[PDB]
Amino acid sequence: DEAYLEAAPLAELHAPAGMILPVTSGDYAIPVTNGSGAVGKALDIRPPAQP
Amino acid sequence: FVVKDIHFEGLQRVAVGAALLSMPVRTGDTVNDEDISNTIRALFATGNFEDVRVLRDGDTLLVQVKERPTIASITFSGNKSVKDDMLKQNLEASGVRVGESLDRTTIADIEKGLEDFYYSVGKYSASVKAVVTPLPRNRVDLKLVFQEGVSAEIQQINIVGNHAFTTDELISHFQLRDRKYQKQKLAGDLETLRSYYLDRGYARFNIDSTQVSLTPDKKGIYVTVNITEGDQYKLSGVEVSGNLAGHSAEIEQLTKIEPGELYNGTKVTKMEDDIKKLLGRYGYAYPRVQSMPEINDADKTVKLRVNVDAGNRFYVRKIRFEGNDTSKDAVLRREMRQMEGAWLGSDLVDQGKERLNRLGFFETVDTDTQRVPGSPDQVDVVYKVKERNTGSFNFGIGYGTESGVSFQAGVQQDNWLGTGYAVGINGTKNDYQTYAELSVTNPYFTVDGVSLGGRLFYNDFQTNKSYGTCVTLGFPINEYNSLRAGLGYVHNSLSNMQPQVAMWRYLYSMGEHPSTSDQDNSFKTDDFTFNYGWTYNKLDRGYFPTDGSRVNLTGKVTIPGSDNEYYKVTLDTATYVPIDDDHKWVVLGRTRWGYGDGLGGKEMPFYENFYAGGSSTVRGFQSNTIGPKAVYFPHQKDLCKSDDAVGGNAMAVASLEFITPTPFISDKRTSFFWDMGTVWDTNWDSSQYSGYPDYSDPSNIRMSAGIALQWMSPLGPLVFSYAQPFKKYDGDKAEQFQFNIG
Amino acid sequence: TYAELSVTNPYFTVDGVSLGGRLFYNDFQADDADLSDYTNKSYGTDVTLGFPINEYNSLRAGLGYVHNSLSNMQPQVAMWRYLYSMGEHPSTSDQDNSFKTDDFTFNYGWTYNKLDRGYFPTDGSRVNLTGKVTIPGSDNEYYKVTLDTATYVPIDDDHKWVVLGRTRWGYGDGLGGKEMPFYENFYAGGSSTVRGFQSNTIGPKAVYFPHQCKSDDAVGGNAMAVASLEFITPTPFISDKYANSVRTSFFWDMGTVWDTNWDSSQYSGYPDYSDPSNIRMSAGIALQWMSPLGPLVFSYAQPFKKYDGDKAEQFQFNIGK
Amino acid sequence: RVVYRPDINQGNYLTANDVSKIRVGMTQQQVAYALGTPLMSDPFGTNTWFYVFRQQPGHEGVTQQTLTLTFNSSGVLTNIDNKPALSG
Amino acid sequence: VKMSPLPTVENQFTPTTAWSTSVGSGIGNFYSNLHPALADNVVYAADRAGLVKALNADDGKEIWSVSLAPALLSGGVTVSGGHVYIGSEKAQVYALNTSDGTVAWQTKVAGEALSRPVVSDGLVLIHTSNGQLQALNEADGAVKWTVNLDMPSLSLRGESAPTTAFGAAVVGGDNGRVSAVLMEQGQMIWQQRISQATGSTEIDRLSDVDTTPVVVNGVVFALAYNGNLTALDLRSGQIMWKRELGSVNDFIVDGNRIYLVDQNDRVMALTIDGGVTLWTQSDLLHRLLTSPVLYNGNLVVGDSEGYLHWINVEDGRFVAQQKVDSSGFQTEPVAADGKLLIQAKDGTVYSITR
Amino acid sequence: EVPDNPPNEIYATAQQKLQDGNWRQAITQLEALDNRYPFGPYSQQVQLDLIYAYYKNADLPLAQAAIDRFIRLNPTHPNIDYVMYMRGLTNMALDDSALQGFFGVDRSDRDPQHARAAFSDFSKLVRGYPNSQYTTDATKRLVFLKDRLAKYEYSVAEYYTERGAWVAVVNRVEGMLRDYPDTQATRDALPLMENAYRQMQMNAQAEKVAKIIAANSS
């Protein structure tokens, strides 16, 4: 199902002058590393064709 | 000698690289017969087959091994005394892992091990035999069968050295009846004897032995236990010191008992547990409490020292829910009476858990506490819950050319889309009767608990038709008690009803002097209602109350220009009291009081009359048949009488019942009761009659006696009741036993 | 209202010999169906032991004791014939009447649950057979037999085109003169049995006596032989990619019920409802489906042949049984 | 204004006999020992603890004792700001 | 489970019972060493309920009815001159008077006195099932000295009745170590473990020297349920030779020949020295046997089913049978001059002669 | 389908049944094939096929155990990246399992545990095998999971904003500033951190959190 597309893109807060935000940790997603794979319904759900 | 190459064949179970890495000397090294034997031994360590040969005839060495089916699975040829799952997991633990290597030596080993295990469970005479079969691609299957006889009956327990009491008292309290032996039960019954002696107060009691013996025939086990009783010890006043938190007044009030009384083990345990709980109530979640008796030969006097170290005050950093699915977190966290970021009121957390079980939508609730990793001072509390899935759903339609439509519908779900609603819809079309109702409550319209609810209904017999709507506000007004107010609308019109005198006097009471003949009556009114109500939930028990009194009261009045002016009162009560200080056996008094009466010169409308009879109102009579009987004008010449039930305007019921989880079966549920109920009709006046009942006074108090049974059922908790009417009058229909749900 | 209580221990004996005790409570108004209007109230107990013989089979056996109590049976030939048989003088002219029995019984049965899937079965067979006999004693000396059968056979190894056969058989008279007329009797029509005929509408219609003639209200019958051949297919249109759980079926049903003891002599003037030859027929289309809230059924039928006053019910819907 | 609501309690249980334990120049770890851990700390780039004691039972007046203390970098107690009542 | 088919033979000896007496209650099915005993024409028998009666050997006529009471009278009678001694599974030991059966004293021992009392040079030895030896002075019942032997938590009933020779006792023990002790002050002289064991987490750890050992010419014979018959040097306790063939209980030696019962419940006989059989009986298996007697020249043993076997002293031929008894036996028969005595489960006593 | 042992060529008809989506036939034939031949050449591929067939049969609790068994059987299979992706997507598929998919009322408020497990697994994939052609969709998973968890934390902060446990809200909304510093939920949440300082009269913090919102909100 499609519903996990159209989730709002992340947009990092801007730190105001003269102070800074906490250190951040845990549930941070590493960037896509230019992954060229398919997205969504285009993904081949089938298992590998052969070992 | 130096070898330049090695020759292998097979390698089914182990690869060439494994052989190269395992062997102590590799290709190109200096080796001799001793080193070759060492390389053979190393290969054995990998798990390969026992038979091997090596030949040296040049620059290369040839090695061969005898491969054979070794990979095994386990099956057993029937098992009665021991279940299949325990057998297979036990077999795995003994060494036969599904997919492990197997050998005849392993067959004997597992046979012996199974014999040992069987002996462990009390069938000392069992025997085990196993065989194997081959499978394609070098595999085996294992089948083993068992020979066993009777398992050991225990006999005399021969408790020796006692001088208080005697054998039968101790063995009566033991789950090991003079039956099957079990070592763990021996431990448990060694603690049940110790606790008995400590409760009686032989605080120097000691057990210096215990052994079991098998008759040479091994059919049974003698138990024996030596006792040293010591002297008759006597308690002395408890003395407290340590890192208290300044609560010494409450601790001393809780810990102090009069001196000279006898020592008791559970007494000291309950006192120490109450001390740590009281510290747990103020926020010391993990106190370190210790108790030691001063034992003195002087006067045999015993004085306990109790040391309490309170530790840190713990703050609940974070409340989480797990299993909260099909329910939004808001509903559980609003029922949770304990706040995040507060000091941990321990029994405030348990009051939360209790209120969640009160809600009743959850199959189980468990409360855990754990410290946050690496910080000394903050506690994390999480609730684990299961869903009842209340949503019983039924629907059906038929549609036919000669039967244009018929239907029945029924939908009651709590937390319909989760959240916290209660939605209840029902409906019907038979050919004789149309019915429908819808109701919606959103009981936390404000987070303080100010409930809102509304109901719509439509009722239409092919004759009586009625429809209406009401709403309520349910604002809680203390910890226990609750209060409600409400408003609504109903309409009725009746038509062609039997010419009953009670109704005709009512109809007359409007000034609508009826036609006293020919069934040609028709009468319609719109009615607008104010509700008050009052409630008292103070039973402190999840399912079957034991020592609390509940009260419930309801009003209606119809001042706001309704086509009839009247009022109603219901009061409903259930007072429970335990047997002396033991809430496991209990007696209760359940009572009611109904009254309803005319306003504005009118008489109360008949259709609002109270009804008596059946499990709902009074045990031992047919449902709603205990109201004063009707009376009719003559038709297919006097004021003819008939034994048919019409509700009364005022009512009283009192029944006293003893609730008894009687341990005739293993306590892992019945009652008996006296019962009375009456119904009477204020504006029914004897002056118009001669030879008719005493409707004008409740004099006709009628009763039953009998017993009831209670049980747990999927939908709801069920009650079963039996009675015979020892005090009943003419035309009082009854039968002896009846069923009800809740 | 209807209520029951049942609990079973799988091992009274270690051979899988289970013991299940059933107690029940019933409150039945015959006016709540097409059945000729009378009230039936009953309660009782059976103690039942259930155990296999091979594979998936079960045997069962069990004594039972039951209470029955009757009231206000509308004054008609069948009911008064039950009273007569029992020897209680009938109040033919006034329906102000009542009658109770206590009854004492044994039952036996067989199950051959060679089924495949609880939902969307394609290759399997079921036979459910139970016999009730009253043991010498009771107030009613009836005997009863109930047989139910279901068989699935795939035409396509792809298990899309399965034929669903069902049959349903029963019979019961009793020892001596204590018939089984009025308190245990089979019914046909509804969504179960032959679809397209109204609930319990198939069978004899009783005869009035004049009261304070032939009527078209059913009493049920004591002899019965329902059947249904139901042919099942892929649905032509729905989104198979999702809908592969939804069942669509074409069906043809047979219904017959009769009374062995409808005496065509005494009732010479009224229809010969003891003839079984009056088989009712219906065939049509049905859908059966599992949805997160509940299972659904839809089925229309043309009851293409039926007898006079047999009340048709051309389309049915139900959820959640 | 009589419909019952559960008592609100929030933050660390400060008391008149513990707060005198706070004195300038204590090391932050020993302040954590003296008053227990702070239920609130400034996320926004400086090392300060906001002890708060707050109760609001039923509908009676809210009562509060906020206690702000600042640590310089490396964790030495520089000051103590005590407000013994709500600003009202 | 397997069982013996009740072997049969023509009654060559045609034995007959001289007399019987229904003294009172039986021992039920409680395995308990409760055999009666004879002394100067008067025999003594006991009932587990507490009843004890003195009977005349030739007619079974009783003279006592004292009950001493439940008390669980056990550890069957032993008689020495004027005193009658008998244990009790409530750790009591009674002394009674042969003349009339009046009580001499009651005294207390460390736990239940299962072992049959043995009288020796003014001391009454009673191996209690706690694994403690105690000796009670013959005159006055006060306990003189005590020795403690370690116990496995699971054992057979440690009858292990001691025997005395040359001023020293030898006694069994449930851990399997035979121990020799001077009679004077309970000083242990030697211990030797009877056999291999421990092929199990517990049950094959059974090593029980349950039988009463015996001593001939300074040579000790010993037995253990799981172990072997063994010969030991009385002086030193080092083992001499082993016998794997049968190890269960209650062996008897007479005429330089050894007789014993196999755990399989078969009788056999062993040569002068070394564990080799000259014959072995068969189809006795898996049915409760009892200690043999060897009363008048025939070797006789009781069967749980209700009857006696009569076996040739030198050969295993089974010759006579069918002296059947009501409900059978769970206790040792006993030997007497020209007479045989034996007690049934129900408590009835019988004598057999020919 | 008879349990009678079939020759290994059954894979052809079994694979056909899989491709045509005869899921009950596929799963029971593949299970039989594995159990009859667990360690032959068609071990690992049959296992991965059984994983997919159980995933399309929607019997997700058994797919969880199956994946766990696969990982502990082989922590280094050359397509183990697919196995991890399937465990992540199996976790989320159990989250959306409610009947609400027809009613359209969201379930962001429900228990986050399965969402958090799914997120952890997808993140472990994106770090472990990023060159896989599964990474990109896994990142599209990660951004939605990191949104859903933050909407849960926001919902609890809103509830305590209503009850008035103002320390509880300041603490949790601060937690969202530690864990989810970039999502929409946190941007709706900063007004709560504001109000929760206001009602506690920590104006020394209110003047910061107003500045942080005002410098950032569109």
Curated annotation (Swiss-Prot), chain A:
Cysteine-cysteine disulfides: none
Subcellular location(s) per record: Cell outer membrane
Domain notes: Contains two well-defined domains connected by a flexible linker. The C-terminal domain may serve as an important protein-binding surface for interaction with other Bam components or substrates. In addition, contains a long unstructured N-terminal region, which is required to stabilize the BamCD complex. Only the N-terminus of this protein is observed in the Bam complex in X-ray or EM structures, most of the protein must be highly mobile.
Annotated function: Part of the outer membrane protein assembly complex (Bam), which is involved in assembly and insertion of beta-barrel proteins into the outer membrane. Nonessential member of the complex that stabilizes the interaction between the essential proteins BamA and BamD. Efficient substrate folding and insertion into the outer membrane requires all 5 subunits.
Assembly information from the UniProt record: Part of the Bam complex, which is composed of the outer membrane protein BamA, and four lipoproteins BamB, BamC, BamD and BamE. Forms a subcomplex with BamD and BamE. The Bam complex has the shape of a hat, with the BamA beta-barrel crown in the outer membrane and the periplasmic brim formed by the BamA POTRA domains and the 4 lipoproteins.
Recorded family membership: Belongs to the BamC family.
Name under which the protein is recorded: Outer membrane protein assembly factor BamC
Recorded name of the encoding gene: bamC
Curated annotation (Swiss-Prot), chain B:
A cellular component term, taken from the record's GO annotations: membrane
Protein family (similarity comment): Belongs to the BamA family.
Subunit structure: Part of the Bam complex, which is composed of the outer membrane protein BamA, and four lipoproteins BamB, BamC, BamD and BamE. BamA interacts directly with BamB and the BamCDE subcomplex. The Bam complex has the shape of a hat, with the BamA beta-barrel crown in the outer membrane and the periplasmic brim formed by the BamA POTRA domains and the 4 lipoproteins.
Result of changing K218A: Lethal, protein does not accumulate
Chain ranges on the Periplasmic side, renumbered to this chain: 1-391, 414-421, 443-450, 465-480, 536-548, 578-586, 659-668, 713
Consequence recorded when altering N226A: Lethal, protein does not accumulate
Cell location: Cell outer membrane
Effect recorded for I397C: Reduced folding of OmpT
Domain POTRA: 1-68, 69-149, 152-230, 233-311, 314-388
Pfam families: Omp85 (PF01103), POTRA (PF07244)
Result for mutant: E402L: Very minor growth defect. Lethal
Residue ranges annotated as Extracellular topological domain: 401-402, 430-432, 494-521, 559-566, 598-648, 681-702, 725-738
Record remark: domains: Contains 5 N-terminal periplasmic polypeptide transport-associated (POTRA) domains which interact with other subunits of the complex, may recruit substrates from the periplasm into the outer membrane and also act as a chaperone. The C-terminal region forms a discontinuous 16-stranded beta-barrel transmembrane region. The central pore is ellipsoid, and probably closed by extracellular loop 6, perhaps with the aid of other loops.
Protein name, entry field: Outer membrane protein assembly factor BamA
Curated annotation (Swiss-Prot), chain C:
Top-level taxon of origin: Bacteria
Stretches of the chain found on the membrane's Periplasmic side: 10-17, 41-56, 112-124, 154-162, 232-245, 291
Extracellular-side segments: 30-38, 70-97, 135-142, 174-221, 259-280, 303-316
Disrupted-gene phenotype: Deletion is lethal. Depletion results in the accumulation of incorrectly assembled outer membrane proteins, including TolC, OmpF, OmpC and OmpA. Decreased expression leads to decreased susceptibility to contact-dependent growth inhibition (CDI), and decreased expression of outer membrane proteins (including in this study LamB) as well as up-regulation of periplasmic protease DegP.
Location(s), subcellular: Cell outer membrane
Documented effect of changing E313L: Very minor growth defect. Lethal
Family: Belongs to the BamA family.
Subunit structure: Part of the Bam complex, which is composed of the outer membrane protein BamA, and four lipoproteins BamB, BamC, BamD and BamE. BamA interacts directly with BamB and the BamCDE subcomplex. The Bam complex has the shape of a hat, with the BamA beta-barrel crown in the outer membrane and the periplasmic brim formed by the BamA POTRA domains and the 4 lipoproteins.
Designated name of the protein: Outer membrane protein assembly factor BamA
Organism: Escherichia coli (strain K12)
This protein's encoding gene: bamA
Residues of the full protein shown: 467 to 808 of 810
From Swiss-Prot, chain D:
One GO process term, biological-process aspect: Gram-negative-bacterium-type cell outer membrane assembly
Domain of life of the source: Bacteria
UniProt KW keywords: Cell outer membrane, Lipoprotein, Membrane, Palmitate, Signal
Subcellular location(s) of the protein: Cell outer membrane
Keyword DNA-binding: no
Entry GO terms, CC: Bam protein complex; membrane
Membrane association type: Lipid-anchor
Molecular functions (GO terms): identical protein binding; protein-macromolecule adaptor activity
Description of the deletion phenotype: Mutants show minor defects in the assembly of outer membrane proteins.
The keyword Signal belongs to this UniProt entry's keyword annotation: yes
Family membership noted in the UniProt record: Belongs to the BamE family.
Quaternary context: Part of the Bam complex, which is composed of the outer membrane protein BamA, and four lipoproteins BamB, BamC, BamD and BamE. Forms a subcomplex with BamC and BamD. Monomer in the periplasm, but is able to adopt a dimeric conformation in the cytoplasm. The Bam complex has the shape of a hat, with the BamA beta-barrel crown in the outer membrane and the periplasmic brim formed by the BamA POTRA domains and the 4 lipoproteins. The intact Bam complex can have 2 BamE subunits.
Record-given protein name: Outer membrane protein assembly factor BamE
Species per Swiss-Prot/TrEMBL record: Escherichia coli (strain K12)
Range covered out of full length: 25 to 112 of 113
